[PDB]
């Protein structure tokens, strides 16, 4: 449902969107496979398809050519670059989307990810210094690059919602995410995705089967 991978300098080459084709500015232009999300992304003037060069700049804290974030206070290879929140659809749902080509499923999946992303924003914090003392500021803004993967084979519909390690403070300064609230809310975020997906599917008219034991769902008549 939800997996959270912490990306650092040690595992960066495994992050979604790290590689791209030289000829292309975008990974997939004129489609919904990628998109910028979050209030931080909008504050940066970012929306629609994700430009690979920009994604990679933000990955390593490059707000712009004159503005590189300092997030390293300790071993430099330990610096967190971001968090991959991977939202995976139930198996029957993936089958309906990928094996039956049901575009409605894709849309509901996207809505559910957007909803979970918005909930994630509530948990965004940054350290600051009021008057000599340190205080945690609720910033309510994230920069997120999302990449949808449609793996036809054992069907697996999921989206990588990559949360940059940054948030915009009240003073306009970009600082590292204080990830504590995010990390202890992994289960909550996963349930938000699950609930919104069920809600959207139900609204479209789909019959869903509920598993009381572990409080999950999947398409009625399907894995």
75 in Cβ contact with 9 (< 8 Å) = no
Query: Which of 69, 145 has the CB closer to Mn ion?
Result: 145
Please work out the total of residues on this chain that contact Mn ion, with binding judged by CB under 5 A: 1
137 in Cβ contact with 123 (< 8 Å) = no
219 in Cβ contact with 198 (< 8 Å) = no
168 in Cβ contact with 40 (< 8 Å) = yes
Query: Which of 148, 175 has the CB closer to Mn ion?
Result: 148
Binding segment (CB under 5 A) for Mn ion, from list 32-40, 115-123, 133-141, 143-151: 143-151
CA distances from 126 to 73, 151, 179 (A): 15, 36, 9
Query: Which of 79, 84 has the CB closer to Mn ion?
Result: 84
Taking the complex as a whole, the smallest distance from the CB of residue 86 to Mn ion amounts, in Å, to 7
Taking the complex as a whole, the smallest distance from the CB of residue 154 to Mn ion amounts, in Å, to 13
Binding segment (CB under 5 A) for Mn ion, from list 66-74, 104-112, 142-150, 173-181: 142-150
Question: Any contact of residue 100 with Mn ion (CB under 5 A)?
Answer: no
Tell me which residue of 88, 92, 63, 89 sits closest to 167, measured CA to CA: 63
Query: Which of 127, 149 has the CB closer to Mn ion?
Result: 149
Q: Residues 153, 156, 159, CA angle at the centre, nearest 5°?
A: 130
Residues taking part in catalysis = 18-19
Q: Distance from CA of residue 171 to its chain's centroid?
A: 25
Task: In whole angstroms, give the CA distance from residue 89 to residue 149.
Answer: 11
Q: What is the DSSP letter of 133?
A: S
Taking the complex as a whole, the smallest distance from the CB of residue 98 to Mn ion amounts, in Å, to 13
Taking the complex as a whole, the smallest distance from the CB of residue 149 to Mn ion amounts, in Å, to 4
Task: In whole angstroms, give the CA distance from residue 54 to residue 52.
Answer: 5
CA distances from 36 to 116, 124, 160, 166 (A): 14, 17, 12, 14
Query: Which of 149, 209 has the CB closer to Mn ion?
Result: 149
Residue nearest to Mn ion (CB): 149
| 68, 78, 100, 149: which one binds Mn ion (CB under 5 A) | 149
Taking the complex as a whole, the smallest distance from the CB of residue 31 to Mn ion amounts, in Å, to 16
59 in Cβ contact with 87 (< 8 Å) = no
| Contacting residues toward Mn ion, per CB under 5 A | 149
């Amino acid at each position: 449902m939800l997996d959270i991978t912490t990306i650092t300098r040690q595992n960066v080459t495994s992050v979604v969107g790290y590689y791209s084709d030289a000829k292309d500015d975008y990974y997939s232009k004129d489609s919904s496979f990628t998109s910028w999300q979050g209030t931080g992304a909008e504050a940066l003037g970012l929306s629609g398809d994700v430009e690979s060069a920009r994604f990679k700049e933000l990955l390593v804290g490059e707000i712009d050519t004159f503005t590189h974030m300092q997030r390293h206070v300790g071993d430099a290879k330990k610096e967190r670059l971001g968090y991959d929140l991977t939202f995976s659809a139930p198996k029957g749902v993936s089958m309906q989307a990928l094996i039956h080509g049901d575009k409605t499923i894709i849309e509901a999946h996207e809505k559910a990810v957007a909803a979970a992303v918005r909930e994630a924003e509530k948990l965004a914090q940054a350290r600051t210094t009021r008057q000599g003392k340190s205080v945690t500021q609720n910033t309510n803004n994230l920069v997120v690059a999302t990449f949808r993967h449609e793996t036809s084979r054992d069907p697996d519909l999921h989206t990588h919602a990559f949360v940059m390690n940054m948030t915009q403070r009240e003073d306009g300064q970009w600082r590292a995410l204080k990830n504590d609230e995010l990390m202890r809310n992994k289960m909550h975020l996963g349930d938000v995705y699950k609930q919104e997906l069920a809600l959207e599917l139900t609204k479209a008219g789909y019959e869903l089967r509920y598993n009381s034991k572990n409080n999950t769902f999947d398409m009625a008549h399907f894995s």
